[PDB]
Amino acid sequence: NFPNSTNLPRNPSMADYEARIFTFGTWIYSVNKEQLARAGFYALGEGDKVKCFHCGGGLTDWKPSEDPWEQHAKWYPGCKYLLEQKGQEYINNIHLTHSLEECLVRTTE
Amino acid sequence: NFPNSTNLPRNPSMADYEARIFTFGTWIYSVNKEQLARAGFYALGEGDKVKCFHCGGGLTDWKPSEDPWEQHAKWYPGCKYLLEQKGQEYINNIHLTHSLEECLVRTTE
Amino acid sequence: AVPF
Amino acid sequence: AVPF
Ligand SMILES: [Zn+2]
Ligand SMILES: [Zn+2]
């Protein structure tokens, strides 16, 4: 069984998809809202600031390209919601790729 | 639609598990027989030699600690039976990890 | 993107 | 393992 933290969302009022999309009413942003919503994010009404309804992690300065799920796992690998939705390989993969890049860059000292 | 061969196994007579475990009658080898069978492998009867019934890849010299699925991917990433069975992120996972290990050992020149 |  |  999972702990205090973990099992339990940091913002239960946002666990539902619907609940979150409704925060992206006025989405003047590049990054797709239906997508942000699916990844578990909801808008804070402060620019493109979003936050996960579970681990509570927040992301800003989204780039046009970026995939919610990747950024989610890239910074908040430990989210339980994320593990349930995208599994281990995904998370660990997003992360192995980066570690690899750091290592291929280190050949430049 | 997804090719000729890829679509078609290299040894249809070994497409069913039951068919494969049998080949493992006398398994005096460390690696588990049920597991190999599950991973698509069967025994040629030439020692610990095995061959995937679909991509036709063959492995030997198994170490006690090895996982059928991992070495199948470590060596035969392209097998379709593997992709259906263990998915994309799994395969790439195994390969990235190796790629990382290499780069980390390259700091040693 | 970025954390906050 | 090793391939063959
Ligand atoms: Zn989260
Ligand atoms: Zn195969």
CATH of the domain at A4: 1.10.1170.10
Inter-chain contact B100–A103, Cβ cutoff 8 Å?
Answer: yes
HSE value, Cβ hemisphere, 13 Å, CA-based, for A4: 0
Selection from B97, D1, B63 nearest residue A99 by Cα: B97
Ligand nearest to the CA of A36: 1
B17, two tokens:
């598990």
Answer yes or no: is A103 a known binding residue: no
Q: Resolution, rounded to a tenth of an Å?
A: 3.0
Give me the number of domains chain A comprises.
1
DSSP state for residue C4 in the 8-state scheme: -
Q: How far apart are CA A50 and CA B91, in angstroms?
A: 32
Q: Which residues of C touch A (CB under 8 A)?
A: 1-4
Q: Which residues contact B39 (CB under 8 A, 6 or more apart)?
A: B52, B68, B69, B72, B85
Sheet holding A50-52, edge to edge: A41-43, A50-52, A58-60, C2-3
- Count of other CB atoms within 10 angstroms of residue B64: 7
Contact by Cβ (8 Å): A73, A95: yes
Answer yes or no: is B103 a known binding residue: no
DSSP state for residue A64 in the 8-state scheme: S
**Rg of chain D over CA atoms, in angstroms?**
4
Beta strands in chain B (DSSP E): 41-43, 50-52, 58-60
Residue B44 burial (CB < 10 Å; 0-12/13-18/19+)? Answer: middle
Name the residue range of residue A104's domain: 1-109
